[PDB]
Symmetry: C3
Subunit: 252 residues, 3 copies
């Protein structure tokens, strides 16, 4: 129940340097492995830097605010190279970068294939995150994965808004439960059925010997629109009512 970001192709990767394109970040996913044919080179089972110093990195980014819950690193699958320690940096606004845990040096790998996982408690909240290898065996070469919370069903909703009124004297006389429907068409048709929230912004109504009774309900909601049912009861004479509505479409 966390998301493997690289496995799902959710993040753009950018390395500092690449030994060459056959050692690029595209070869860096956790457990990456390619042909065992020893007669041809189809790429390192790792990202491998070109320059060996303490300034190399891979930046992983996208526009969404991610809640990173863990990172896993691994050495290189096909040669004895691995990152033995690293630092992490991240940014929420893509302008100001901070060091994870005050520049903590994280102890990492000691062989080609064993996975080392660090859990973030609390999650790192970031748009971009960078692994900054500090020490290495033989070469700065690694495979990795970044784990994030799944997107919530309530995130990134679509919204259309409008207003609706009775607009005449339909409810301005009579006795007992009395209702009128105003059909509202959304400016644009939704892809799926939204919810429709409403709030009153005008009352022009007579009490029934002091009792005020008015109600609005959004009903018969479709992708194209909905009905605002205006309601009164007892003997109230309602002259006009106005609602603003906010139609919200989730998960689409």
């Amino acid at each position: 129940g966390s998301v493997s970001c690289l496995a799902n192709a959710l993040l753009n990767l950018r390395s500092s340097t690449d030994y060459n394109a056959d050692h690029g970040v595209k070869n860096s996913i956790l457990n990456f492995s390619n042909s065992k044919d020893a007669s041809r080179f189809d790429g390192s089972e790792s990202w491998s830097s070109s320059v060996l110093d303490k300034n190399q990195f891979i930046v992983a980014g996208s526009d969404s605010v991610k809640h990173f819950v863990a990172i896993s690193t691994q050495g290189r699958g096909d040669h004895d190279q691995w990152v033995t320690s690293y630092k992490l940096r991240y940014t929420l606004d893509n302008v100001n970068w901070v060091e994870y845990n005050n520049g903590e040096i994280i102890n990492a790998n000691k062989d080609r294939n064993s996975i080392v996982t660090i859990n973030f408690n609390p999650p790192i909240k970031a748009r971009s995150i960078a692994i900054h290898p500090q020490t290495y065996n033989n070469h700065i070469s690694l495979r990795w994965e970044l784990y994030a919370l799944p997107v919530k069903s309530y995130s990134n909703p679509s919204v259309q808004v409008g207003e609706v009124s009775i607009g005449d004297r339909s409810l301005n006389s009579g006795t007992g439960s009395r209702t009128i429907v105003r059909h509202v068409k959304f400016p644009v048709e939704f892809l799926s059925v939204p919810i429709v929230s409403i709030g009153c912004k005008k009352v022009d109504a007579h009490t029934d010997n002091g009792q005020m009774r008015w109600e609005g309900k959004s009903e018969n909601i479709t992708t194209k629109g909905f009905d605002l049912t205006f309601i009164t009861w007892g003997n109230n004479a309602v002259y006009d009512l106005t609602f603003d509505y906010v139609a919200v479409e989730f998960n689409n």
Copy 2:
């Protein structure tokens, strides 16, 4: 009126394996073609895998919920290699993957350049999607494009909220149409002019021989704020009114 996702650089791609970086997913867009100079190799006109089996794939992903309406595949431009059938997998939450149409094997290409397009009715709703070649002529090599519905103008809106009241006895006396304006400044200035929806959460008002009359309108909306015009008429004495507002900025 569909979006060519790869052409527009909207999706991250990740292959299972690459024959080498000069056969990577970066060379996989539909109709990809490079130099005709036979004296140098600038890359295959295809993604080409390294391992030939039924387990290769390209994953295409991003954070947004896409509605995929079609996929097109093509063989390799510069050699006689093409995928002859494939399966599709996808995921909406990036945790749970499903097979398209119960693992349907889709019949695909039979030459280098002819495009084979499959239409999805209904659209596949997904954050990530993967093509899983099953059979091939000579090598797992392909070019492709994924077509999605365009983003709606109502998607990803920006929102600020607040409340506003009369806050004094400005409307608590008098006859005829009577109005007061409260100017509201948004916590942060918007990039473009929002809409402003409102809903009443407090009425403290006297009826005019039984008739209740109150209204609020948001007016003079700018990037920086708006005016809440509080309104009464007839002889109503309105002591206070409060609205919550929801300012929504679209398409920005």
Copy 3:
């Protein structure tokens, strides 16, 4: 206070052609430099095209609407190649592309390393943007960066909605300030504390010798829910009230 898009790995890049993968767009970031070791080739300090004509490009894209404020270009770090002029194209909807400033040819670089920056007034509003080199010294080779406004704290909010009523005669008798709390649980727990906006959609209440007094407040908001405090005062007998609420979570 602008965002360096490529530095932060925020955009997918796609070139028209690459001299080969060691001259790909992955080597195109502004100021990109790799090993100075003259004995091995770890890639060009540039993207370099394969075909030399007026039809080459790099497309930079993602789903988010960006407000691009500037572009910077540079020639190739390790050889005497640079783009001397280019055009820009962009798209907001990823269907319809437009030429920047009526197809203006922008004067660009004249050496390997000096940066040439063009500022966009007003910002270019786009999901994808493409640099289209027109003329070049020796080869179409460049490094570049795209600068965008930072994301606003109000963008991409998460939203849950619902309704709440008194649902009994708790406020239907008595004198003075009288309140009841209805606890609302959000359908799903938020990651951080939201704001909760409310709007009345039903009044069933008696005036107090003509004075109407009712109020709702959202209070004690947590990640899990909030309290709708229903309020009356004076001697009003309130039979029922209903609010719709819109809970909005920012920056998460």
